[PDB]
Amino acid sequence: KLVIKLESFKKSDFKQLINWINSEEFLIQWSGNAFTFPLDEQQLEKYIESANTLAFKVVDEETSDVIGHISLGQIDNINKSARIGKVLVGNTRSIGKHMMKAVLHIAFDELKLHRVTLGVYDFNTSAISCYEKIGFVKEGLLRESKRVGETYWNLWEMSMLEYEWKK
Amino acid sequence: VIKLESFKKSDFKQLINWINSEEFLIQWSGNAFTFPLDEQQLEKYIESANTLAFKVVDEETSDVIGHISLGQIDNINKSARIGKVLVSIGKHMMKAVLHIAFDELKLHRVTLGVYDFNTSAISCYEKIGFVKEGLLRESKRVGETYWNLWEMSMLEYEWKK
Ligand SMILES: [Cl-]
Ligand SMILES: [Cl-]
Ligand SMILES: [Cl-]
Numbered sequence A: 001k002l003v004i005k006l007e008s009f010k011k012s013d014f015k016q017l018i019n020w021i022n023s024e025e026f027l028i029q030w031s032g033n034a035f036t037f038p039l040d041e042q043q044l045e046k047y048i049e050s051a052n053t054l055a056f057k058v059v060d061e062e063t064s065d066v067i068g069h070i071s072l073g074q075i076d077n078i079n080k081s082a083r084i085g086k087v088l089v090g091n092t093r094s095i096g097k098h099m100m101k102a103v104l105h106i107a108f109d110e111l112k113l114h115r116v117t118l119g120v121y122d123f124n125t126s127a128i129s130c131y132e133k134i135g136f137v138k139e140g141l142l143r144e145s146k147r148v149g150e151t152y153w154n155l156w157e158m159s160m161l162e163y164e165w166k167k
Numbered sequence B: 001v002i003k004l005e006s007f008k009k010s011d012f013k014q015l016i017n018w019i020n021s022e023e024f025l026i027q028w029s030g031n032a033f034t035f036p037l038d039e040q041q042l043e044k045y046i047e048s049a050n051t052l053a054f055k056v057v058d059e060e061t062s063d064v065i066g067h068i069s070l071g072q073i074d075n076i077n078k079s080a081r082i083g084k085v086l087v088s089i090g091k092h093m094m095k096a097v098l099h100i101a102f103d104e105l106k107l108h109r110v111t112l113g114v115y116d117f118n119t120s121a122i123s124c125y126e127k128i129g130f131v132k133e134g135l136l137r138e139s140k141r142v143g144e145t146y147w148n149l150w151e152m153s154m155l156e157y158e159w160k161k
Helices: A011-020 A024-031 A041-049 A095-110 A125-134 B009-018 B022-029 B039-046 B089-104 B119-128
Strands: A004-008 A054-060 A066-076 A081-089 A115-121 A137-148 A151-161 B002-006 B052-058 B064-074 B079-086 B109-115 B131-142 B145-155
Touching: A004 A066, A004 A095, A011 A041, A011 A066, A024 A081, A024 A137, A054 A095, A066 A095, A081 A095, A095 A115, A095 A125, A115 A125, A115 B131, A125 A137, A125 A151, A137 B109, A137 B145, A151 B131, B002 B064, B002 B089, B009 B039, B009 B064, B022 B079, B022 B131, B052 B089, B064 B089, B079 B089, B089 B109, B089 B119, B109 B119, B119 B131, B119 B145
Parallel strands: A081 A115, B079 B109
Antiparallel strands: A004 A054, A054 A066, A066 A081, A115 A151, A137 A151, A137 B131, B002 B052, B052 B064, B064 B079, B109 B145, B131 B145
């Protein structure tokens, strides 16, 4: 089962992602503080040129369509860590699980890192269950850490260490 | 007993002398610096965006007795991070920075990190009102080993004095 492949996200994929991220609230769920709504070409250009960041389009092996997005950021070669983020299943079997496993393969097997982190807002309980099934562990709840209008959201900080990925 | 004042070039040598090893540099400041600490790194620190650097001044003698910082000051999320804490006095320093954060800057959340072996600092911070949120496992590499960091926080409704 090669169901998806990761390829480098490029300028010709920008409009598609701009269309998928259709509201401010959704932009925040997807990417936190990385961007302002709406997304535009200048923000995405800065993203794909940033140091210590790998940006991926997710390609369906069957159709060759681009069906999502994912990123490995904060790549830190002193502490041997990185952060998965900007996780989007754009359409469609768990494509999300395949995407997570493909990026984890890059992080632990190709880059040889020790620790991979991820943040997810506490109301996204089906994503959280999926991530726990893959092997992520909740480290703690960052209380009221993102402001969204007049309220604050709480973020679960989650991680996997290399001995949880492979023995 | 203490006041916080803007950290300047004339305070750099003193701080460089206080930071005598790489392990201590890491306990104090995490990933901010490379050992040894030097004037070029400090100049960049005092010019960094979203950062307030403080010398801690004894009101009685006017001597500089420590250091503390409020960093990652974030106006969208109304948050900041206390760090670079260097020394009773420790409590006074924390309360002075918390006063700036909550009462002057009107922030909602203040965070802090402390490595899990520093259990006396942890107790002191819990007495002041910080709450443990979670343990970041094996998050700092130090030589051939890893340390674990407690992420702690105070929200504005948990602050009184
Ligand atoms: Cl544009
Ligand atoms: Cl001042
Ligand atoms: Cl810090």
